[PDB]
Amino acid sequence: LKLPTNLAYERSIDPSDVCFFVVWPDDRKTPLTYNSRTLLGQMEAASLAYDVSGQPIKSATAEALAQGNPHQVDFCHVPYGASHIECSFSVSFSSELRQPYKCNSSKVKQTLVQLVELYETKIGWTELATRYLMNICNGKWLWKNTRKAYCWNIVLTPWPWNGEKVGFEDIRTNYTSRQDFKNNKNWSAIVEMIKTAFSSTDGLAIFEVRATLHLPTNAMVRPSQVFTNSRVFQSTTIDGERSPILGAFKTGAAIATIDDWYPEATEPLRVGRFGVHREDVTCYRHPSTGKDFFSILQQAEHYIEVLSANKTPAQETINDMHFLMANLIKGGMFQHK
Amino acid sequence: LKLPTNLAYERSIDPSDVCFFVVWPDDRKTPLTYNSRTLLGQMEAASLAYDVSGQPIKSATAEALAQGNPHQVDFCHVPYGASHIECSFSVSFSSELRQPYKCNSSKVKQTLVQLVELYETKIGWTELATRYLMNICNGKWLWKNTRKAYCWNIVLTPWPWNGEKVGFEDIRTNYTSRQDFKNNKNWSAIVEMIKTAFSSTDGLAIFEVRATLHLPTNAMVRPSQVFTNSRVFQSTTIDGERSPILGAFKTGAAIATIDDWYPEATEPLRVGRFGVHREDVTCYRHPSTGKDFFSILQQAEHYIEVLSANKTPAQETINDMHFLMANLIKGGMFQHK
């Protein structure tokens, strides 16, 4: 397959900013608020006392590393009398991966608007839909706030939905796996809706997610920081007062942490062309290995002929095409100018 | 009909910028406002790791693709507690297609005025009028905003009007086809108003449209970008506050995406000389097919003698006639120096 000079995809999952609210014992709600603090940190930086090649700076004497340095940081935390903290956002699944947003070459358009179809026919949407939905239903958009917490509950409201709200209580204890999610009475009724929103050419599935998070006393809340204080928070204005948020793109990067299929598959990565592990920077699915998205998109017709056959393919190629479809769902410009 | 050196038409469909408002549950309106966020994307471009002809860049090491590249984007979204988002504009239909705005050739001018008159008498305006009006009455000028939306209602107040204002509720469900629009009690009284603005020599039909759009919480709004951040919104200043808008020409392209008449007709295109598609960039109605505007305008006398006959014309020639009159409604300079 040749990479056309104009090939864009539009994202299928659209998540919204996670508004943070504080719920008091009288069950009234009030948006969180962060305030800028100034800290007197120690001279802990290695570049201060040390030079490169392991050389101690001579001016940085035992008198110099004494004088602490001030750093201004934003600071947010659950107020004292707060019963819990709510976290609300919305996420819409649409079928914007069926057809490319742009394609200057129609030949490469048929091999994609068919790749998706033969995918859904042979290897249904249930895998990616379930993976995307687990991150919705287990707090993963609540990135680190769920790390040191008592319990967080995901109350979920699907839009083209008939029954009552679908809850996920104490995710730390019950919903610790895929099967524990499946055991929910309404789990299948939701993965079905997501996989419908992916097949139907103009269908969608809007979820409104609301996490009640029981943090300890005065517990520090971690919202998203802004890009280049040594810690500036990303905020909206609710009720006319500023309030921290986990950004829409942070939430999207959270929901789209399904990519576990790669060499030395260890834990889910955010779906991207070259699977970039943000913590240990080295990106897996480097182009030097045959696992980046542009090397597996080059083999799109090979995957067409593999799924068009009668036999169910190998798990290797089915995981490769899972990653292909997840990268299509992420959207983006699959082009090279 | 050889193309004169001066032949311009003034447009007939004059739409305005789509002002965005946020209607709060207390029923007060405040214009939207966007702010320039700065995202940390990954190294996602194909050009960053691959050279042309599929050659992996050597300096694009695993740690080289790890670095997150900043991207400043304008973000607009519905505020948290907003009841909904209103979208208001005004579109005026006029008979600025009857006579050419400028025509240095008295023969080409009269052979087009006679063409428009024969069109009006033979194949009435109720075909382009209803298609132009459907794009107004179903949110189509709300380009991507109605994609992931609970509902949208188009309330439409015609200017030379006598009754009550014309509602089009829950268009995602109710008004999904042409007959669904025709079932409106005021639909005929509006398509006739449009076809009277096109027939009467100096009459006009001013419509004021207001679409209440029910998005999910914090739902991202997609207004028009500007022509080059990485995404700069096109905005006005409502109430002294910058507010994103859909440009007048974006809204005009929306109302005039009626050209479903072309070789391998699939879905409606924006009425243009050589009907270009922006999704699959290639241009239908290329001059190599006899469907471009200057190839079916060169045959204006043929359509005169066809519509002058008593028999009902073919559907193919009547589609050519439709495209011709729609492209005259769009206006422009049909000249060749």
Please indicate if any CB of chain A lies within 8 Å of the CB of B69. Answer: no
Question: Who among B54, B77, B281 is closest to A16 (CB)?
Answer: B77
Contacts of range A106-113, beta carbons closer than 8 Å, 24 or more positions apart = A106/B280, A106/B282, A108/A1, A108/A2, A108/A4, A108/A7, A109/B280, A111/A1, A111/A300, A111/A301, A111/A304, A112/A300, A112/A328
What residues have CB less than 8 Å from A286, skipping those under 6 apart?
A274, A292, B49, B61, B62, B65
Phi then psi for residue B249, to 5 deg, are -80, -30
- The residues facing A87 across adjacent strands are A20, A211
**Which residues from A are below 8 Å from B279, CB to CB?**
99-103
Please indicate if any CB of chain A lies within 8 Å of the CB of B279. Answer: yes
Instruction: Count chain A–chain B contacts defined by CB atoms under 8 A.
Output: 139
Closest by CA position to B50, among listed A277, A334, A105: A334
Strand ranges in chain A using DSSP code E only, listed in sequence order: 7-9, 13-15, 18-23, 29-31, 35-41, 50-51, 55-56, 69-75, 84-94, 102-103, 151-158, 166-168, 204-214, 235-238, 241-246, 332-333
Comparing alpha-carbon positions, the chain B residue that sits nearest to A335 is: B46
What residues have CB less than 8 Å from B3, skipping those under 6 apart?
B108, B294, B297, B298, B334, B335, B336
Please indicate if any CB of chain B lies within 8 Å of the CB of A287. Answer: yes
Question: Who among B37, B81, B220 is closest to A16 (CB)?
Answer: B220
Residue A52: is it exposed, middle or buried by C-beta count within 10 angstroms (0-12/13-18/19+)?
exposed
d(CA A234, CA A17): 10
Please indicate if any CB of chain A lies within 8 Å of the CB of B24. Answer: no
Helix (H) or strand (E) holding B72: strand B69-75
The angstrom resolution of this structure is: 3.1
* Backbone Cα Rg of chain A: 23
Contact: A16, B63; criterion CB under 8 Å: no
Please indicate if any CB of chain B lies within 8 Å of the CB of A155. Answer: no
Please indicate if any CB of chain B lies within 8 Å of the CB of A332. Answer: yes
Q: How far is A287 from chain B (nearest CA, A)?
A: 6
3-state secondary structure of A206: strand
Phi then psi for residue B251, to 5 deg, are -65, -35
**Which residues from B are below 8 Å from A336, CB to CB?**
45-47, 50, 52
d(CA B329, CA A131): 50
H helical segments located in chain B: 46-49, 62-66, 106-122, 128-137, 178-182, 187-199, 248-255, 293-297, 300-308, 315-330
d(CA A60, CA A49): 5
Please indicate if any CB of chain A lies within 8 Å of the CB of B37. Answer: yes
Taking the CA of residue A269 as centre, how many other CA atoms within 13 Å lie in the half-sphere pointing to its CB?
27
Please indicate if any CB of chain A lies within 8 Å of the CB of B278. Answer: yes
Comparing alpha-carbon positions, the chain B residue that sits nearest to A100 is: B279
DSSP string computed for B20-43: EEEE-TTS-EEE---EEEEEEE-S
**Which residues from B are below 8 Å from A334, CB to CB?**
46
Contact A89, A16 (CB under 8 A): yes
d(CA A271, CA A321): 12
Please indicate if any CB of chain B lies within 8 Å of the CB of A227. Answer: yes
Comparing alpha-carbon positions, the chain A residue that sits nearest to B63 is: A282
Residue type (1 letter), A45 = A
Please indicate if any CB of chain B lies within 8 Å of the CB of A288. Answer: yes
Phi-psi region of B37 (alpha: psi -120 to 50; beta: other; left: phi over 0): beta
d(CA B83, CA B80): 9
Residue type (1 letter), B147 = R
Query: Which of A9, A17, A337 would you mutate first to test chain B, the one with the most B CBs within 10 A?
Result: A17
**Which residues from A are below 8 Å from B176, CB to CB?**
none
CA dihedral A44, A47, A51, A54 (to 10 degrees): 60
Taking the CA of residue A107 as centre, how many other CA atoms within 13 Å lie in the half-sphere pointing to its CB?
6
Question: Who among A159, A226, A282 is closest to B62 (CB)?
Answer: A282
What residues have CB less than 8 Å from B220, skipping those under 6 apart?
A14, A16, A248, B75, B76, B77, B78
H helical segments located in chain A: 46-49, 107-113, 115-122, 126-137, 178-182, 188-199, 248-255, 293-297, 300-308, 315-330
Discontinuities in chain B (C→N > 2.5 Å), after residue: 228
What method was applied to determine this entry?
cryo-EM
Closest by CA position to B292, among listed B256, B262, B269, B328: B262
d(CA B66, CA B50): 15
Contact: B49, A294; criterion CB under 8 Å: yes
Phi-psi region of A256 (alpha: psi -120 to 50; beta: other; left: phi over 0): alpha
Number of helices (H) and strands (E) in chain B: give both, helices first. Answer: 10, 16
Helix (H) or strand (E) holding B87: strand B84-94
Contact B156, B139 (CB under 8 A): no
State the CB neighbour count (10 A cutoff) for residue A62.
7
- Whole-Å CA distances, B44 to A72, A263, B292: 33, 19, 39
